[PDB]
C-alpha cells in the first residue's frame, strides 16, 4: 500500500516529517528477484530526496539472518548504501541514483581500474578494521557455497519440470576434482590456504562482493558505486576478481529468450586484466604496484584458475514472474567451464602444481 | 565577525534557518593565499553540515577575478567544481568536500594515479562534448600568453629589487624558443594547433585545471575531488597532464626554510605515466586504450615536452605566509634546464625529429 510506505517514510526520514504526501511519489521497481522494492521519491524541487524503499520477500539452504547481519555492517561503514530506517519486515536504503554500466562499458580501461580499486577497498575490511564482525566465518565459501547449491540443484531436476543432462552430468563429475584444482593437487584446509596465500594474494582471504557483475555497479555523479551484497562473504580474492572478469562475458539486457547475450571472446585480455589487477594491488597494499612486476604476471594467471569457480556457481545456481531463461543461463555457463579448463591446460595454467610453486 | 558569518549562513543555507546559533562553529583556515576562507559546521550530530564561507580578497597586475568567478559558476553548475550554495559579490557559501589532501607521496600509488587522470579526462571534454559549455570562454591555450603575462609581471618584482640572476637572465632567453620547441619548428598558431592535434592527443584543445597538484585533490570516502579552479582555462591537453606529473617533484608540507622539498627522482616513471595516458584516453576517447598501443607511446613522448612549460610558468610565477618564493623559482628554472637537458638526451627533443615520422 502508497499510503502505508509514505506515513512509515515520513516518520522516519529526517526531513519528511512536514512533507505533504502529494509531493511524494511510490513507483515499485521489478527488476529484483526476491523483494519488494520501491523507489520513494520527493517531487518537488533535503538529503535524502530521493529513497530505496525494501520489504523482504521470502527467499528461494539460505539463511536470510547472516545475509541482514552482513549487509547492517557494510553500511555502517559506509560501503554499503546507507540504511535510514530498519525494522523486521523491512527498511528504507539511500537511494543510489546512477546508471548501471553496461556490458561493454567493462571494456573500458577507465571503467575497469575503477572497480578494481573498490573490490580492493572491500576486501581489506576483514584485516585492516579493527571493528570487523568476529561472528562472520574466516573461511572462504567458494566450496561450501557449490556443493550447498549443487545439493538445492538435485532437488530441482527431480522435479523434472528440462536441461542437458550430458552436460550436466559431466558436471557433477568435476565438482568432485574441484578442490584439488583450485589448491593445486591438495583438498582444501585453512593450512593449505595460509601456505598458498604465500604465493600469490590471488590465495588470500578477503570480504569478497562475490557478485559484482555491471548492473550492480551504478555509475554516480563522481564515482562507481557497488550493490547487491547477498552474495558476500570471506572468500579467496581470486575468485571475486575471476568472477568480475566473466561477466565480461554475459550480457543481461536482452528482450527476447533466453534473455541474455553471451561472447565468449570478450572475456578481457590479459593486458586489461594485469592493469586491474596493478590497481588491485596498489589499493589493498598500498604500493606502486605495475603490470610489469612479478607479484602481478603470478596472480594474473592464478586469478584464470578461480574463473571456472565463477562458471560452476552460478550453474548450479541458475538451476538451484519474470523475463529470464534460468535453464538454458546454466547450460551456457557449464559449457564456457569446460571451454574455459580446456583453455588453462593449454595455456599451462592448469595444473597449479606445475608452475605455481617454481 | 562570526555572527555576521553565522546570520548570513543560517538565513541562505536549506534547513539552517532554525538551527540555534550555539550548534555552530565557524572556523577561519589560512591555507589559503588570497581569500578569507572558514568552515563553518553545525557541532551537533542535513545535506549541508558542514560548508565552506568564502570572501573575496584582493588579489596580488593582469589578474582578472571577473572570468574566474565566471569559469567557477560554470563549473560548480555542471557539478564537477564544489556545489555553490548562495552566491554574492563579496562571497560565497560553498559546498565543504569533507576528505584528506592527498599526499606527494601518494601520486605514486597506482590506483591514485589513475583515479586523476580519469578525473582530469571528465574535465578535459567540457569543451568538446558538452552543448551548454560557455561560448565567451577563450578558445585558445592559455600556456603562451601566461607565460608572457607572467614574465612581465616578474620584471615588475625583480626591479622592485628586494633571487639568481644568471639562471633568471637565462630562462629569460629560454622563453624566445619556448614557442618553437612546443610546436615542433613553428611558432603558435590555431592551424598549426589543430594541425599537430592529428598527430596526438597531447595537443588536443581541452579545458585544463592548469594547478592539479596533490593538495587540490581532496580524498572522501568514495573518490577523490579537485578543487581550487582559479587557474583553469583551456589549454593543451599536454601541459595539464605534464604538470601533475611535476608536482611529483614538490611536497609543499615542510615546516622550516624553504618550506617545501624536492626530489627530481621522484618524477614518475614512463610506466607509470603511460599507465596514466591509457586510462586517461579511455574516458576522454570512450574506448579501451592501454599502455601497449602506439597512441600511448607517442602521447606519452609528448607530454614530456610540456613539462618544460610546468617548470617556466611557475618559476615565473613564483617571482610574481610562510613559503619561500624566491627559492622555489630557483628551483622550477633549474630543473627547466635539467629536463630540457635530458629531453634531448632521449632524442624526445626536437619534437621534429620524431614527431612526424
Ligand atoms: N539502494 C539502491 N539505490 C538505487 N538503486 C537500487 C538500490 N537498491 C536496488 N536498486 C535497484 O534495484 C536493483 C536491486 O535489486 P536487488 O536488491 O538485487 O533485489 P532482490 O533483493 O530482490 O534480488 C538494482 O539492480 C538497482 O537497479
Ligand atoms: N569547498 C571546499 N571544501 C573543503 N576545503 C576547501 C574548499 N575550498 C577550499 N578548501 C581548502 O582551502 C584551501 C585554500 O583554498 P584556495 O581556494 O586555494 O584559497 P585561495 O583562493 O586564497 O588561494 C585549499 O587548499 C583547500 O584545502
Ligand atoms: C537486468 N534486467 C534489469 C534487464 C533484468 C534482470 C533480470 C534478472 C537477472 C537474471 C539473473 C542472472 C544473474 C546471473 N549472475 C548471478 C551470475 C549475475
Ligand atoms: C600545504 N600547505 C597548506 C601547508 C601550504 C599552503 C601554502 C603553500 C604556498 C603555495 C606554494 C606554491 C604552489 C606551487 N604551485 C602553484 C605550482 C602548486
Ligand atoms: C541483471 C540483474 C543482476 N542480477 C544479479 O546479479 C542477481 O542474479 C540478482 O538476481 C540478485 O538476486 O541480486
Ligand atoms: C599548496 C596549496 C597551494 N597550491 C597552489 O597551487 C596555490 O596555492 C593556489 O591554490 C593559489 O591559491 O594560488
Ligand atoms: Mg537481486
Ligand atoms: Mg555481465
Ligand atoms: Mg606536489
Given at each position: 500500500?502508497?499510503?502505508?510506505?509514505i506515513?512509515?517514510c515520513?516518520?522516519?526520514?529526517?526531513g519528511?516529517?512536514?512533507?505533504?504526501?502529494?509531493?511524494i511519489?511510490?513507483?515499485?521497481?521489478?527488476?529484483?528477484?526476491?523483494?519488494?522494492?520501491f523507489?520513494?521519491?520527493?517531487v518537488?524541487?533535503l538529503?535524502?530526496?530521493?529513497?530505496?524503499?525494501?520489504?523482504?520477500?521470502k527467499?528461494?539452504?539460505?539463511?536470510?539472518?547472516?545475509?541482514?547481519?552482513?549487509?547492517?555492517?557494510?553500511?555502517?561503514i559506509?560501503?554499503?548504501?546507507?540504511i535510514?530506517?530498519?525494522?523486521?519486515?523491512?527498511?528504507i536504503?539511500?537511494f543510489?541514483?546512477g546508471?548501471?554500466?553496461?556490458t561493454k562499458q567493462?571494456?573500458?580501461?577507465?571503467?575497469?581500474?575503477?572497480?578494481?580499486?573498490?573490490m580492493?577497498?572491500?576486501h581489506?575490511?576483514?584485516?585492516?578494521?579493527?571493528?570487523?564482525?568476529?561472528?562472520?566465518?574466516?573461511?572462504?565459501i567458494?566450496?561450501?557455497?557449490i556443493?550447498?547449491?549443487?545439493e538445492?540443484?538435485?532437488?530441482?531436476?527431480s522435479?523434472?519440470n528440462?536441461?542437458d543432462?550430458?552436460?550436466?552430468?559431466?558436471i557433477?563429475?568435476?565438482?568432485?576434482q574441484?578442490?584439488?584444482?583450485?589448491?593445486g593437487?591438495?583438498?582444501?584446509?585453512?593450512?593449505?590456504a595460509?601456505?598458498?596465500?604465500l604465493?600469490?594474494?590471488?590465495?588470500?582471504?578477503?570480504?569478497?562482493?562475490?557478485?559484482?557483475?555491471?548492473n550492480?555497479?551504478?555509475?554516480?555523479?563522481?564515482?562507481?558505486?557497488?550493490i547487491?551484497?547477498?552474495?558476500s562473504?570471506?572468500?579467496?580474492?581470486?575468485?571475486?576478481?575471476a568472477?568480475?572478469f566473466?561477466?565480461?562475458?554475459?550480457?543481461?539486457?536482452?528482450?527476447?529468450?533466453?534473455?541474455?547475450?553471451?561472447?565468449?571472446e570478450?572475456?578481457?585480455?590479459?593486458?586489461?586484466?594485469?592493469?586491474?589487477?596493478?590497481?588491485?594491488?596498489?589499493?589493498?597494499?598500498?604500493?606502486?604496484?605495475?603490470?610489469?612486476?612479478?607479484?602481478?604476471?603470478?596472480?594474473?594467471k592464478?586469478?584464470?584458475?578461480?574463473?571456472?569457480?565463477?562458471?560452476?556457481?552460478?550453474?548450479?545456481?541458475?538451476?538451484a514472474?519474470?523475463?529470464?531463461?534460468?535453464?538454458?543461463?546454466?547450460?551456457?555457463?557449464?559449457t564456457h567451464?569446460?571451454?574455459?579448463?580446456?583453455?588453462?591446460?593449454?595455456?599451462?595454467?592448469?595444473?597449479?602444481?606445475?608452475?605455481?610453486?617454481?
Amino acid at each position: 500500500d502508497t499510503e502505508i510506505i509514505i506515513g512509515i517514510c515520513r516518520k522516519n526520514i529526517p526531513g519528511w516529517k512536514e512533507i505533504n504526501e502529494s509531493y511524494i511519489e511510490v513507483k515499485q521497481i521489478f527488476s529484483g528477484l526476491t523483494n519488494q522494492l520501491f523507489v520513494v521519491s520527493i517531487v518537488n524541487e533535503l538529503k535524502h530526496p530521493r529513497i530505496l524503499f525494501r520489504i523482504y520477500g521470502k527467499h528461494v539452504f539460505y539463511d536470510s539472518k547472516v545475509e541482514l547481519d552482513v549487509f547492517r555492517y557494510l553500511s555502517n561503514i559506509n560501503i554499503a548504501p546507507n540504511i535510514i530506517a530498519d525494522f523486521p519486515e523491512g527498511r528504507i536504503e539511500e537511494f543510489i541514483d546512477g546508471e548501471p554500466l553496461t556490458t561493454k562499458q567493462l571494456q573500458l580501461t577507465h571503467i575497469c581500474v575503477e572497480v578494481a580499486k573498490n573490490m580492493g577497498s572491500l576486501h581489506i575490511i576483514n584485516s585492516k578494521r579493527a571493528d570487523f564482525p568476529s561472528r562472520f566465518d574466516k573461511e572462504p565459501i567458494l566450496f561450501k557455497r557449490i556443493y550447498l547449491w549443487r545439493e538445492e540443484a538435485k532437488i530441482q531436476v527431480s522435479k523434472n519440470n528440462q536441461i542437458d543432462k550430458e552436460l550436466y552430468s559431466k558436471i557433477l563429475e568435476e565438482i568432485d576434482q574441484l578442490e584439488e584444482l583450485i589448491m593445486g593437487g591438495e583438498k582444501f584446509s585453512m593450512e593449505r590456504a595460509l601456505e598458498l596465500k604465500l604465493y600469490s594474494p590471488a590465495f588470500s582471504l578477503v570480504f569478497a562482493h562475490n557478485d559484482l557483475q555491471e548492473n550492480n555497479l551504478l555509475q554516480t555523479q563522481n564515482n562507481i558505486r557497488m550493490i547487491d551484497y547477498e552474495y558476500s562473504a570471506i572468500n579467496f580474492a581470486g575468485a571475486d576478481i575471476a568472477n568480475y572478469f566473466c561477466e565480461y562475458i554475459y550480457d543481461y539486457c536482452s528482450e527476447k529468450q533466453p534473455y541474455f547475450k553471451f561472447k565468449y571472446e570478450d572475456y578481457p585480455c590479459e593486458e586489461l586484466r594485469k592493469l586491474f589487477i596493478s590497481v588491485y594491488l596498489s589499493q589493498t597494499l598500498q604500493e606502486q604496484v605495475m603490470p610489469s612486476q612479478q607479484i602481478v604476471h603470478i596472480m594474473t594467471k592464478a586469478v584464470e584458475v578461480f574463473t571456472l569457480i565463477s562458471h560452476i556457481t552460478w550453474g548450479l545456481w541458475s538451476i538451484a514472474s519474470v523475463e529470464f531463461d534460468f535453464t538454458e543461463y546454466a547450460n551456457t555457463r557449464f559449457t564456457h567451464y569446460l571451454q574455459k579448463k580446456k583453455e588453462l591446460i593449454d595455456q599451462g595454467i592448469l595444473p597449479l602444481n606445475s608452475w605455481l610453486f617454481n
